[model samples]
Target chain A: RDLSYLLKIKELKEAKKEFEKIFIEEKLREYDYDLKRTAEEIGIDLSNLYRKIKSLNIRVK
Target chain B: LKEKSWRDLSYLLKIKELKEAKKEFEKIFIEEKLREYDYDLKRTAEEIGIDLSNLYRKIKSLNIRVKS
Candidate 1:
């Protein structure tokens, strides 16, 4: 039914941000919060990853 | 960016109805990307892998503000 992928204009922007947050969080958790490994897995520079994590409010241990 | 774009396409492509959904998706996508790059048009387009000129068109069409 592909209902899982339908786009809704309501809260659309927030939804995207939430998705990004969750995706990054999952990646971070998957790497045991190692910024280096997480960034490498995400294919972004370490600095960029740091910035994104900070901006996304992801808590790292 | 590649993975993000592909996922975006997957969502849009899976829509049973194509009415205005693409436009809506593009607007939100561009707006978020713009904010991510701090409203830098060139950087936003380059990061999103779209041509600069085409991004300008989308910006204008979507009535997005570079500084706001």
Candidate 2:
């Protein structure tokens, strides 16, 4: 749990969703937008990764 | 880089889905916070910046085991 998230985000949903968004984006960028590798790095299944990408509205090419 | 970044990653590792991964992290994070507040929901809610009702909702939905 990050102190900043708790202290600054104010809303649990905002904290949780923002954290997930940034984390997934970073990993996706790190893997050069390779969904499979991104999922592997994030320890999530490929389908779940796709779901997150869609839900989070992350742009990948 | 944040020191806790890798540690956060560690929590997600081996989880098979983002939904489960989020659940795992929430369970662990909230459980630890609950412990920190000695199971006092009011103080925990204040510290976590969540409404008491929402906290209760989260606890229930997350299936968190709270020591009574």
Please report the candidate that would top DockQ against the real structure: 2
Q: In terms of lDDT, which candidate is strongest? A: 2
Question: Fraction of native contacts in model 1?
Answer: 0.00
For residues A1-61, write the lDDT of model 1, one tens digit per residue: 1222323323344545554555667667767999887677666688987887778798886
Docking class of 2: incorrect
What TM-score fits each model? 0.42, 0.57
Looking at model 1, residue B63 earns an lDDT score of 84
Local accuracy of candidate 1 as per-residue lDDT tens digits, B1-68: 33232224434433322234446556767787776568887777776666889989988898877785
Instruction: Please give the lDDT score at residue A59 for candidate 1.
Output: 88
Interface C-alpha root-mean-square deviation of candidate 2: 5.7
RMSD of each: 13.2, 5.8
Candidate 1 displacement at residue A15 in angstroms: 1.9
All candidates' lDDT scores? 0.62, 0.70
